[PDB]
Design a protein around this nucleic acid. Sequence first.
DNA 1: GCGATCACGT
DNA 2: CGTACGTGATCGCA
Length: 577
Amino acid sequence: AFTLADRVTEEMLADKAALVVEVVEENYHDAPIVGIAVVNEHGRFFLRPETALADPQFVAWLGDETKKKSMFDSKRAAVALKWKGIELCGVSFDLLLAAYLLDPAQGVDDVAAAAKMKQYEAVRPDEAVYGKGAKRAVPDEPVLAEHLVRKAAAIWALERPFLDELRRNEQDRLLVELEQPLSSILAEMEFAGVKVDTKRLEQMGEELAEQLRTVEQRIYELAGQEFNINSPKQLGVILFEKLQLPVLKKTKTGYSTSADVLEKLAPYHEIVENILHYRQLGKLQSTYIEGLLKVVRPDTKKVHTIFNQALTQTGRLSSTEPNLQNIPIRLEEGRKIRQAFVPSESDWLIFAADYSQIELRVLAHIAEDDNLMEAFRRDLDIHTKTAMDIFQVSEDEVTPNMRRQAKAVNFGIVYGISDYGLAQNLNISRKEAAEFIERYFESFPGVKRYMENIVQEAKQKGYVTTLLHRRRYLPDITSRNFNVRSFAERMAMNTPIQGSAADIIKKAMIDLNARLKEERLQARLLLQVHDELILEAPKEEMERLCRLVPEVMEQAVTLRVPLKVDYHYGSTWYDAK
DNA sequence: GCGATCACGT
DNA sequence: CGTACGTGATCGCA
């Protein structure tokens, strides 16, 4: 049983408690808090939010760093409280992060899923209480209050066994010194938001919409017909049935119309280049112009992403609603979208710092490949050096095409090395890609050794680890299905690289946050994009930041090779280039 | 409401 | 069939 409390009392403010600050809306920014549960040594309590969040003693308890709280997904609550002007401190255990570190592949997304990991089932899944999608709703107080108290009681019961397993995994410091401090930094980042120049976006959208009508009309005059270009159904019967274009690859139901295939088809018909142009314009228009404008808060012209900290299998963050980690930059037309991301105050600038080749530097260090480490010690262009070695030529003999292919091997080697994906990527045969690999491994024998040894260790231990002891279990490494096994071997090779890079930038974020506060700087972290950090700061702080941010990022860990950080600043995200 | 394509990023 | 890891939009079916 539990107390359905009318007012806050002192026994609810013990210095240790499991706390539930329930925000049911998926996007928690400026979202309602529907209820609160506290379990401590004195009892189990449900508090209505409009009561507890108005009680200065409860608010003081929330904000006291010496009163320790155990929670599930504290960042959700922390941010929902930030929007009410209330500080959340003292969160010493986050069950969501603890479950994520113990096994990311469980997809642990609620308290019930995490409790099942320890044979605790006295709590319902959120989706069983709230419903799914359309039918989603907050239930009556008795049903809500029992759910929140069952979640708090589970967190209370589950902290010792999770912490015990984290300790056995040598992951206790990972949780307490990396992921939980990082949760607080991400909350500040999401709450700060990023300013959007919405007239610029709107003006871009009208230009795209003009160029989309023109290209659309050209596609119809080239097909002799009107049809929905956005549908691979109709597009396939225009291209491969009406126009008789060669079918270079079939999908499951019909024909494939990837940009992979269409570029091969361009010699045969003028329609193909126009379809490709239509698709690129439509992507910007749909995902990045209209998509962004839909999530901008009209009162502040800011977007407030949500960083999913417990989702990827490698330890990367992900970014939702909006995804600020896939804003275009490769092609110039779409890169202009970054002009609409601006500082949130006058006379501030955007500052962006990015690791140079962090994955291949981590691999140099992890593999202790003499040739790879020396390449980075000499600060070589790694793709050109790899080409010199694979093709056995001097620097001046590296053609652009050789460097492009050596680059593809290098991006392949970070992924699962297997040829078919390189052969597909380089539009070559398996037979030829295989010999690319063989010549790479003759040049970097320590990488070869590391790739053999890590697959062997994944089979022996059942998991691979990153630099800071993140793990990923790989049960498919023993499968007798060749596809399933190969996927697990590729993950065994990639995950210590991709995941160690993720560890490093997360530690840098923590180190950067500490330094900016020590230095009393107004600069604020806004975004992380896997290997870059994006800040905004007063114009008067740029010179100091040029020295500070790269140093902190470069010194986050000490590897057998240097870490290298490039950085740029400008009046928009675009100009920070 | 829900897989399958497709395309955007690192 | 497979390059690694994500998110979002569109379509099409039931």
